[model samples]
Target chain A: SMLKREDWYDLTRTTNWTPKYVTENELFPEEMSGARGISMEAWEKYDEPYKITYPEYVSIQREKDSGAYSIKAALERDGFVDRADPGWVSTMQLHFGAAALEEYAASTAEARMARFAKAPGNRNMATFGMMDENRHGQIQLYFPYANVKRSRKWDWAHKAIHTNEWAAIAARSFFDDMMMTRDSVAVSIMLTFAFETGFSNMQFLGLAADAAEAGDHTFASLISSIQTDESRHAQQGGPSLKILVENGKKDEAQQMVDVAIWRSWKLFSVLTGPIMDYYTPLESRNQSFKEFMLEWIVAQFERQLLDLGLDKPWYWDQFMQDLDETHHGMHLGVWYWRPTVWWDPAAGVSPEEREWLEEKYPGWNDTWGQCWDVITDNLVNGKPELTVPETLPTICNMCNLPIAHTPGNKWNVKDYQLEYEGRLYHFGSEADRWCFQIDPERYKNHTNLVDRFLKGEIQPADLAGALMYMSLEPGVMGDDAHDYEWVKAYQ
Target chain B: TFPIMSNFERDFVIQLVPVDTEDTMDQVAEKCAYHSINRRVHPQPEKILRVRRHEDGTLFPRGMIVSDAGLRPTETLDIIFMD
Candidate 1:
């Protein structure tokens, strides 16, 4: 108030002083800092759009926490879970498990930028981002812990990443690549810009709307609070990306963005895609998964790319086609391999639901609907075993997901196989293959779930052994959310 | 053993099926069909299942052995119900 923020903010954030005893290169190594031949004079001009003082950050953060906690306290008096649809409950269970600990990973990514980023604005912003991620991780875990008495699946908030569960493996593989391994500059672009800015809206904001409509005020408030922080920190990506572009690293930056988008899309297709389209109650769903992607990811992210002087990914056409196809295939795999996951999967294939799918994706009945028709027949015909998975699906080496393709009449499945350094690498899409080819050293050594099975690392070489290896036990494993009650619509 | 795509199953998931290296193409077709036919895809008793390169029109000879198939590990093969 005395001097105003704009007067003092520039001086505080632009303090990229010269190194005294140590060489500048020694202090901010190119590997860690990712200076990438950018002049120090240019990096000093790194301007963060959302400027906040430490005092301002703490005050804002305290209010957000207070607001979120108060809502949880008030809402706990009423039993929301007992009254909520199983599908809605499944959505929260999946979200907390898949997302909570990853917040901690994000914290580490932010901390790396705070310490090693050459741009003083980036380091200052990342300092706040690091704290924000810690708060997010803690709050997400705490919110779900209160529900441990209700369901053991909530325990996955803390336990999921530690296990070799396929979904956990996939999430780890993606995050490890995006956050844990990349340098500060790359982390800013991949984690904040490509992942958070581009894709997280589908999980946080999109699902928060559904959560609010579904009457889970606690979850809605918590995620909304988290997203407010994300909006601030995710801005780190743009300025850092701008630095890369101005310094003639535009192609490198573009490749990072492209790889991250595809990788992020694959994980979300398995996680958020099913939750939005299948696991949320039909009544509460505001938009279909494809619609949310179009609004939040495609339209918004594409505009951001163009503004940043970056071209759309080469696989843009394929990605648009996949917007209709991939998630449906992922949903089927998740339902069939439901036993492998922690949360119950909603069949979400009631006749009414099928009509919605057909409306959103024309020709659904000819493709995905035909698969569901077979599942419905199996359930209604008293052959429940036929509905259960006997054999595992082929997992992609790149995405670590079941190699998904359009099903039924338009069964277009391709394995973009790469014979690299005496090993055969399988990718689900051309983009996935391209991602690996660009940085083969980063990805080549990691073995996917299918590779482990073929190598006889999963003992007994059967389904039982596979489940055991994945750490799925009786009560902790997934089943139909509605327990086949949804099949009555068909009957 | 191989991971193959089956058109019989309405879903687009690829399944892992076990087959002896010496197993005939007809034998491999039956193994692949076992996962889909009675399960997601209904029985088609009048139709015989055939194996081919994924998305290719030509079918592998019924008598051809897996050892001679030259298929890589997890190389996708298409199994379709043919007249």
Candidate 2:
């Protein structure tokens, strides 16, 4: 009989590694393999819970692809594309542009772990994980390509990360730090555990449910299929964490989780929060952003941390409060600065929509709703010029998000700033400030929009100059998705 | 039509708030107490001992009306805390 699956898999894993002829440092440099000082004996215990050989991996992944591609083919002929809400279209552009290319970067990260991780079991798992990421990137890219002819904004699927687009800058800063530069152990914790297991689930499962409910079967199928691979690869982190904790490296592990989770949450608040609450038609919005955060993101991550014997992040209370208020400003900012985005922004707030917002967030009227009041009057009273931006707001150098937070009840807006090595840096929150402090070298060189302005990089020093700097062509500049029709509901 | 009123109106518009657009500087500070700008930016609480006109980002004299301040619906008056 042919060799049994278990026997062949064990043989492959055991045979891949050999005792180095040179010292461990010479063989696996400390820079490449982040576990330099840790004992090989400890690393030998790096056992992956969900074990699969190449044949089994190929078979399962093939089945998933076949099922999803079949669904995609069937939906290709459907009228759903032309008839879908602009809100849904906006969600698609944002997801594809922000997430797909980032997967390619994650594939590079996985390849680094596959080559450099000290444990054969961990390396074997990463080989599969690398393949998983390539699949994620290609599938996401292909799906958007199918729609590119329908809208030019879909072109950003391949193009967004290459530009200095503010949203793209925010996305790159997060993904590049975790995937491109982090050590293997840190990457496993940050990318696989904190980001994939916790945050990606919020986007895929959470958004998939909304999509399926909204009758967008193609998108629902795509993200759901993608999560099955995430389910397998994300397990690599827990085993890595178990090893670290057992080796008395729990502090480092906790710090990685704390930093990555905070960074990932900031990205999601802008990327996913608005799509769920504002862009999805108000009637079909099953849960508010905060409700979903409490249900899926908060509850699950808290349980995960405690289960792993790690404490809640020190900023837990602040994070909880942010879940309520952070994205409100982001939604307002993105709309006010709509022309900077590739996809059309639906100013989904009308009187009816405001009532919906009020129901979800009790303090909405007094806080953010007060600002929107002015915007609504300008829109209705025919003073559209009042709505346009003349000067850019100060942005956080680390997160690349605007430092426009109203943190406490007093409503005083301020930036959490740092003066490092004769250069000033600003952060959207203390958490972002902490991330930079943990590894200042990795982040310090990068400058924000305000920095560029101060450096005289944005010539002409006006809105037109800023728009040109951002690569937003005149026609490509996003207008109101519904042509300001959403405003008429109040009138 | 701009500032919609609830059925239960307060008998008097407080100081910082523009009751009839003739409020004084000190009263404007009292009116802002109604919104409590400090609580929103707490831990980084600022002293709102100054006011600024919205049309231009410049400080206003203590005596100015809502009209003189170029205050309209959607036009923001900076409740400034000059250190």
Candidate 3:
């Protein structure tokens, strides 16, 4: 407190260098570094706008952790944890499983940037980013530990990322591409600007608002605290992008954004979309997921992209079409593939929920809802066998998720297939195939369920056999969150 | 059957289409629209071209059965969606 804030800020973070002991390439190599053609002068121009010193970052983050942990403690002690809605529990499980470990990976990415980035300013900011991601992963992991007594699925917060769970694979494929493989500049844009700023920030805003309204103040505070740090670190990407765009590396920057945005959207289609549209009880759901995305993601993020002197991605129209259709398929797919997940899935297509869906998405009834009819009928009668799957569907080798789409009609289903290096692979979309082609060596070795089956790697070659390959067990498999009691809403 | 070799477009992803080769054009059209939005409900679907671009490309209309439309294994079918 004795030193003036401005003086302290100026005194710290002046760690630039000419690398006299080592060559520039040794300090920042090309293959791992995304700053390929850019010069040293441009790297020197890298500036993080919301500058914070180490002391300030520590003090504020400590306060945030104290606040979030205290509320978490109280939520447990007051029995509010037990009183939380089943839908919210699903929301938390899905969020924790998909979101936490990614943060840990992101922390590693930040640490790499902090150590190896060519720019001194970038390294300084990434140092703070490293700490922030660590905090995020730690806080998220702790919340599940606090609630572990209620459900074993909560432990999946720690284990999910390490497994070959389809959703986890989809998430890891994305995060690893951005953080693990790419260089510092690319991670800054894809991770910070495109993903955190455009997608994850809006997702957090919507979820936190929904959580607070649903009286899960603990989750609301936790995400809000995380978002505050994200806002500051996200600034690092903006200046880096400007530098890249200024140096005529706009194509590289644009492609990074496009790839990361699409990947994030694919995962969010399953992870956040269902929680917003289905997992939040209809009453507490303030806005449909589409409305939230249109406002927060499409309009706002698109405007930001335009301001960044970049053209809209070639798949803009396709993305718009997806905003309407993708998540609906994911909701149904997750429900059908419910046994493969950790948290129990709520088939939120009760009579009332269907009405909400129809209202929010105009063609919900004729398109997605029609597929739900068979499920509802099977659950209504004593014939659950008709609803459950006995055979495994095709899994996309790229995203490593089931190709469980029924976009236009029910049976027009074809697994998007690719033949490379004499091996056949399947994908969920054209974009997914393109993602693989960007670097086939990074992905070509991974095999999906169908590939293994074709190769006779799986025994019996049925859904049971496939589940065993997926590491699913009695304790691991998911069941209906509501035990099919939700079927009574039709009556 | 019309020749579809010269007018073939090769950008879209290829599918291991499991539809019966004996299925009618309308049934194939229905099957092709499986992952498309609005195609289920859209009154007009533009055109459904049963295309093959394995090396020499071919586009065949979906008004006939798959066997009649010069259909072969490992071909790309382009589903054009016009608003």
Candidate 4:
């Protein structure tokens, strides 16, 4: 039998784990956990009422895919397909081929396994999530390519991502952040928050607008399918974050928050923040990036973060206050490096495109209105041989990000250092992060596993390491196991 | 026109939208062939103006549709290349 969407939710969240020994008061040392804050009780309050088992999920998704194909074939036979605007087809092809196939479908399966592939019920949830991501990725790729093949422009666009130099660099960097390079910490910030909540904020808006504008029902159906799955995956972040905070070491927890705020915002600056800030030509009003951020992230999960004593509006203070230019500057060191092969994404920023460059970035005016220039400065400019200083400030031990953020300035550089657990971390430049895993001397042997990730060589350990390193923190979740059903966590 | 257009920052993508709408489509053959141009290209950049074509057989509209686009009778048609 085909699994419906609701079935996955019901099946995955089947068990309610409560603490046997810890009392609610004893379990929760801080404040009592919220219904959304990993409370074993929060399981009862899933706002997403739908649930589906894996078998049911695969079956229904297949049904949707098949129905879509038959309709497409019919359209092609009558040539009514061409009767529609070509832009509509472009919009549809993107939904199925790239967004679904490459980004969502391919990445999620691995991501689920990485997070939840343990030997139990949660493992099954992870397995189903993995399967769902694969379907999403492959199918998203298939539909657009299949539908738009007649147009010559469509044929090579796929290859452009692979062959073009600058384009490939941007894409390569993006996917690495999203899928490949992200460790658990990276996953939480990059995948869950930035890529999921941040990037998809604009994407969902853009797709919804496109569907409505062109009056394309098929595009609407396909996007709705992809989005519904995303909504489920997006749910995982707050739960995951709450759980992590409880077990996470104090210093490392702060680091996670830092990277979470910094990386997510930086990544979103170009993709979603700017897209919402500028791109989507909504007939009604041009929504700002802050608006999207608030609705998507702040409203859904960030509110819970505030309730949990996590920093509120983690980076808004810095974003809202800037120096130098009237605008803010982006954090795009990777684009300067261009590690990925293919397109020459290093082109000049058009006057219109630069608006995204202004907001959400720190130190905007000195380098406003220039894409390649900002990248070029990081590349050709800067202190010779000092790759560390040029790209950004030193990494703050608390946040793992360089202290390049100033309250008001279009400044290109910054400097700051923090010490934690008797060890120091440095970010000579943005590229300094790439040196991780290669050197065992600096970050590898540190007191925190989080540093091992910064220096590279980040491998998962057994439960002992995770438990000791993660939960049982001084003021976090370890104390709240009894008072809040979620206090004890799934373990 | 570039083949294979990508969506912003590679978040999503679209492919193969037609670039030239008027001159490229196959339906151009059905255009009214009997009409003649009221004016000629002035300081006319290259072949960017419409010349009067008589309805006589053998002078099909053919490529002339490139210049005469959107020009109402007695109206001046401005020509510009988007690229």
Which candidate tops DockQ? 1
lDDT for position A267 in model 3? 78
Clashes of each: 0, 18, 5, 81
Q: Which ranges of candidate 3 are over 4 A from the true structure?
A: A1-4, A7-11, A404-416, B1-83
**Model 4 stretches with alpha carbons more than 4 Å out:** A1-51, A66-101, A104-116, A119-121, A147-153, A160-164, A182-190, A197-202, A214-217, A248-254, A273-286, A298-301, A320-491, B1-83
Pick by TM-score: 3 or 4, better one: 3
Going through the candidates in order, what fraction of the true interface contacts does each contain?
0.64, 0.00, 0.00, 0.00
Report how closely model 2 matches the true complex, as a DockQ value. 0.04
Among residues 3 or more apart in sequence or in different chains, the pairs in candidate 3 whose N, CA or C atoms overlap within 3 Å are A412-B31, B4-B58, B4-B59, B5-B57, B5-B58
lDDT of 2 by residue, A1-491 (tens): 78877666666667344566877677677887778478766788887878888888999889999999999999988858788888888888888889889998899899988888887887888998999999999999988888888878888999888878889999988898777787787788889999998889667888788879878898899999898888778888888888888877889888889889998999888898778778888889888999988998888998988888889999999999888777876776677778888888888788788889989988676667666666677677776765655445557678788655442232534445576887756667889998999889888788877677656688776668878888778666777778889777656
Residue-level lDDT for A49 in candidate 1: 86
Candidate 1 local lDDT, A146-172, one digit each (tens): 889988898899999989999999999
- The order by descending TM-score is 1, 2, 3, 4
| TM-scores of chain A across candidates | 0.98, 0.96, 0.94, 0.53
Q: Model-by-model lDDT, in order?
A: 0.84, 0.74, 0.71, 0.37
Model 1 pairs whose backbones collide: none
